[PDB]
Amino acid sequence: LDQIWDDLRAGIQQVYTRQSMAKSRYMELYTHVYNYCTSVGLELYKRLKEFLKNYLTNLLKDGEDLMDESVLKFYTQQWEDYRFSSKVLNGICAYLNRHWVRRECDEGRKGIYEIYSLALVTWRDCLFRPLNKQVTNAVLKLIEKERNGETINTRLISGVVQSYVELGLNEDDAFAKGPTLTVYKESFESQFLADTERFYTRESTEFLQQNPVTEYMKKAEARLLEEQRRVQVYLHESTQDELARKCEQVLIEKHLEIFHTEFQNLLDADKNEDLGRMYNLVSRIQDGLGELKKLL
Amino acid sequence: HSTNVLLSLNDQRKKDVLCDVTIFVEGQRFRAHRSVLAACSSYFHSRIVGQADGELNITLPEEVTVKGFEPLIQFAYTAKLILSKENVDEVCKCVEFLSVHNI
Amino acid sequence: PDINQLPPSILLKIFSNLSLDERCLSASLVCKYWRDLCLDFQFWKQLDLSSRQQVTDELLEKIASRSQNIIEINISDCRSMSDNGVCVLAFKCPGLLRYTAYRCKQLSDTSIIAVASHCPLLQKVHVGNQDKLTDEGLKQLGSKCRELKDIHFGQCYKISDEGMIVIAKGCLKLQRIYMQENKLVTDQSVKAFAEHCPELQYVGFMGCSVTSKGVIHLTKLRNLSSLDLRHITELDNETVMEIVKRCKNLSSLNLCLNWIINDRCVEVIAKEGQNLKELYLVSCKITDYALIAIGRYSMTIETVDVGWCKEITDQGATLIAQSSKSLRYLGLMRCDKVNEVTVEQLVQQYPHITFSTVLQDCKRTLERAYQM
Amino acid sequence: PSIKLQSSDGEIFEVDVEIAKQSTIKTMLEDLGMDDEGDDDPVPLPNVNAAILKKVIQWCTHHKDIPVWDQEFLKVDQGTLFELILAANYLDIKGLLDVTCKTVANMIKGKTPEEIRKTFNIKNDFTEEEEAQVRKENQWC
Structure with a gap:
């Protein structure tokens, strides 16, 4: 019904421009939705889907090709606005959700979702677009201030992470069991790990060629603590184990051959404070204390 | 007397209505109540008290025979038995027993 | 005032409050619109045709002919259809979930074969007293549809050894188990199947021949909830102690009719048991000495079951009657060592108890039967 | 905490906000509670009139199988009924659809086709030649 749809669209367009x-x-x-449905809503669902697709397509001609530290502002702001307005629109379309969609899916049938899940899928196809590689590249470049930087604006990164967790597969498989971090892993975590490995390999080699082994252990422990803490301000709970294993395998378990010689030299001239640091570092490894236990 | 209660329950049982616990023997269904079989045979209270369901379905081992079984419920209800000399041995326990029946 | 002006959702909500007999006998002859409303996937995805005797023999061709989402087939107590009349429906079985058929003797392993290969999705296979259910079909049941999550195989003396191993190697999603007096069940089929899925909560092996060699290894899993080890072959006492000390999450423990089990277990069950909720001790040879411990040292208890107790202390029972705050579950039966005071005074002293004595539960049963 | 619900034809109904908190007004305040309120403006309900909205707040005030109070409250005309069904579907009062759709099913239950057809003024849009096939299709009782 166009008599309904003219004003319905005129109200939905101002739900998304948050005029309150x-x-x-x-x-x-x-x-309007109630009166239409009780007069079914298949073509209403089609109109809503078309509206969301066109809205995102026109929205996304802006904010594109503004790559570094500027896709972050764009993506975070537009994501929070879109998510709030889509919750409001779902509240409006609750009747279509409760009676037509529920009766229509009712088997696992694909292609028909609730309005919130429909908008989430449409915004995922917004992510399934160049605005998921330069936001990720800029997040990596912003984290790559592991050297120095204090106005890093953590809220730019963490929010992005949140988006990648909300866009886990919503397409009514059977039900939301638990955490759904598939897009998160695939689009952020692999690159994050493969970048931290390279950073710490280069840094370890440079520092060991620049300084002796006695106070490289201090740096290794400090960097391990820093990486542990970084997972709590860019927080997702299930990254700590894998990041810790990467950091231990790169910082230690690759310079063990010089650790053994430094152990012997530390034993010769009794520095009992460095041996505790070495014991902790090599005990973080699995099955690494064997040669130290024989040199002793 | 409570024997009036027992006789009334017996007559109600012998209508296939108000029957709560159903016994199954190779296909035959013998209907009865919930409290009385609990009071009678200690094998039955075991399978009964652990549930609060609606309709119950208790099956008996091959060791218990139908031919002696019908008068068992009758003696549980009205304490009167009919029996001749051919079918005695699978009942000769005089403390009922016949079921497991180590007490 | 027109009822047909209401939206179809409201009419379906109204029609859902009528039984299948009412819906197919009265509301389907009023008019065309009501007949078309009382025919849906809504009303024909939960069949529950139990105990419809000699009326559904070849009819199962029409109940599932155009229906696409039968998920709750229930043909318990069936005595009319044959293997053909169940395999015709088994051919389609789109997403069947909770197949149930108790006491249907005429059914054989052919029905199991038909239902196990035409639906790779299942959740409950609670079959019952069907005899001649040999173990060849359950092999393919575990081989093809490895999605089943709940079995029930009581009174089927043909599931000796192959069945448990075959639906123990492939299938892993099982949650509940129930078994009955099924002979020829060896111990070397559960010890291997004790490390894959530790999420089992209900365990029942009544009248079975499971040796304690597998019960000893139960300390591995720490997520067990309910136990039904009635008439078991000398389970280890220390294993029960460890599972009741470590596993705080424990719901039910029956252990009825066990004679080698001694008084020590119930003596010590009140030392630390706080979340224990019911006890079924029938014909137990208790030495009327643990009552003092179960009353003094236990403060959280609401269900108590006294069975064929030849001896009892009336003073102790009276003391524990008011010792607790809500423990009123005295279902006394055949208690010869009783006085005539409790059954005469506590009936009116506590108007929140039902009791179970013969003198009382004869008028009450008749009254509640007459009212309903 | 006072919504100022206005009826369809116009009558202002102040309520405490636990009395009228149902899943289409409860949801509205959750999604429009972040910003400033509109000076307690009336929230018109264009599909609920002023005689039915009185009973809806009477039923929701008490409740802050078909019990005694709900048996005597639902003692209205069939025309005052059939609109409590629609006004609880419109506002999504999950507990008023249940106790009301049972009542309409309690005068369908066990009354044979004829006086069911008489009770709801249903015109028999049903012939007799095809009645012999519909009574043979549901032969299984």
Whole structure:
């Protein structure tokens, strides 16, 4: 019904431009959906899907090809606005959700979702686009201030991470069991790990050729603590084990051959404070204390 | 007397209505109540008290025979038995027993 | 006032409050619209045709002919259809989940074969007293549809050894287990199947021949909830102690009719048991000495079952009656060593107890039968 | 905490916000509670009139199988009924659809086709030649 749809679209377009209109209107838009449905809503679902697709397509001609530290602002701001307005639109379309979609899926049938999941899929196809490689590259370049930097604006990175966790597969397989970090892993974590490995390999080689082994252990422990803490301000719970294993395999377990000689030289001239650091570092490894235990 | 209660329950049982616990012997279904079989045979209280279901289905081992079984419930209800000399041995326990029945 | 002006959702919500007999006998003859409403996938995906005797023999061709989402087939107590009449429905079986057929003797392993290969999805196979259910079909049941999550195989004396191993190697999603007096069950089929899925909660092996050699190894898993080890062959006491000390999550323990099991277990069960909720001790040879410990040293208890106790202490029972705050579950039966005071005073003293004595539960049963 | 619900034809109904908190007004305040309120403006309900909205707040005030109070409250005309069904579907009052769709099913239950057809003024849009096939299709009782 176009008599409904003209005003319905005129209200949905201002739900998404967050003008914050009163409750006498956002109850008059729910009445349009209710009156239409009880007059089914297949073509209403089609109109909503088309509206969301066109809205994102026109939105995304802006903010593209503004690569470094500027895709971050764009993506975070537009994501929070889109997510809030899509929750509001789902609240409006609750009747279509409860009676048509529920009765229509009811088997696992694909291609028909609730309005919030529909908008999430549309925004994932917004992510399935050049705005998932330069935001990720700029996140990596912003984390790559592991050397120095204090106005890093953690809120730019963490929010991005949040997006990649919300866009886990929503397509009504059977039900949301638990965490759904597939897009998160595939699009951020592999590159994050493969970048930290290279960074720490280069840094370890440079520092060992620049300084002796006695106070390289201090740096290795400090960097391990820093990497442990970084997972709590860019927080996702399931990265600590893998990041720790990468960091231990790169910082230690690759310079063990010089650790043994330094152990012997530390034993000769009794420096009992460095031996504790060495014991901790090599005990972080699995089955690494064998040669130290014989040299002793 | 409570024997009036027992006789009333017996007559209600012998209508296939108000029957709560159902016994199954190679296909035959013998209907009865919930409290009385608990009071009678200690093998039955075992399988009964552990549930609060609606309709119960208790099966008996081949060791218990139907021919002696029908008068067992009758003697549980009205304490009167009918029996001749050919079918005695699989009942000769005089403390009922006949079921497991190590007490 | 027109009822047909209501949206179809409301009419379906109204029609869901009528039984299948009412819906197919009265509401389907009123008019065309009501007949078309009382025919859906809504009303024909939960069949529950139990105990419909000699009326459904070849009819199962029409119940599942255009219906696409039968998931709750229940033909318990069936005595009319044959292998053909169940395999015709088994051919399609789109996403069947909870197949159930108790006491259907005429069914054979052919029905199991038909239902196990035409639906790779299942959740419950609770079959019952069907005899002549040999173990050849359950092999393919575990081989083809490795998605089943719950079995029930009581009173089927043909599941001796192959069945448990075959639905123990492939299938892993099982949650509940129940078994009955099934002979020829060896111990060397559960010890191997004790490390894959530790998420089992209900365990029942009544009247079975499982040796304690597998019960000893139960200390590995620490997620067991309910136990039904009735008439078991000398399970280890220290294993029960360890599972009740470590596994705080424990719901049910029956252990009825066991004679080698001694008084020590129930003496010590009140030392640390706080979340224990019921006890079923029928015809136990208790020495009327653990009552003092179970009343003094236990403060959290709501269900108690006294069975064929030849001896009892009326004073102790009276003391524990008011010792607790909500423990009122005295279902006394055949207690010869009883006085005539409790059954005469506690009936009116505590108007929140039902009791189970013969003198009382004869008028109450008749009254509740007459009212309903 | 006072929504100022206005009826369809116009009558202002102040309520405490636990009395009228149902899944289409409860959801609205969750998604429009972040910003400033609109000076307690009325929230018109264009599909609920002023005689039915009175009973809806009477039923929700008490509740802050078909019990005694709900048996005597649902003692209205069939025309005052069939709109409590629609006004609980419109506002999504999950507990008022249940106790009301049972009542309409309690005068369908066990009454044979004829006086069911008489009770709801259903015109028999049903012939007799095809009645012999519909009574043979449901032969299985």
